[PDB]
Amino acid sequence: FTLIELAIVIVIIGILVAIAVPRFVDLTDQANQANVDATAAAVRSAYAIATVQAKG
Amino acid sequence: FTLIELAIVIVIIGILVAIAVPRFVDLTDQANQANVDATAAAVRSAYAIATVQAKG
Numbered sequence: 745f746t747l748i749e750l751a752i753v754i755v756i757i758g759i760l761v762a763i764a765v766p767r768f769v770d771l772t773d774q775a776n777q778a779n780v781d782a783t784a785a786a787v788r789s790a791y792a793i794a795t796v797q798a799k800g
Numbered sequence: 801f802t803l804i805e806l807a808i809v810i811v812i813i814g815i816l817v818a819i820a821v822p823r824f825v826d827l828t829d830q831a832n833q834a835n836v837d838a839t840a841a842a843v844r845s846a847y848a849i850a851t852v853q854a855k856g
Binding site for chain 1: 802803804806807810811814
């Protein structure tokens, strides 16, 4: 590579770095809560259906 | 209505049915006999009263 091409590369690397980038976040607490809540809704419906099947 | 309320209804209907209930009975024979007998008593009295009115 010519020295000019390396100079251009040295410039552009410095500009394509110094972007923002997202953090990874452990969102499993929020997702676990929604899983527990959705499951609780399912248990209530499953119970209601069971009261008809059981006739009691 | 909720599924629970319908389940409760399905239970209670099954218990308020399966009572006893009386048959209707054609008791007109027994009543007709009593009418004929009571009328026969009246005819005897009406006759007795008539024997006084008729003087014979």
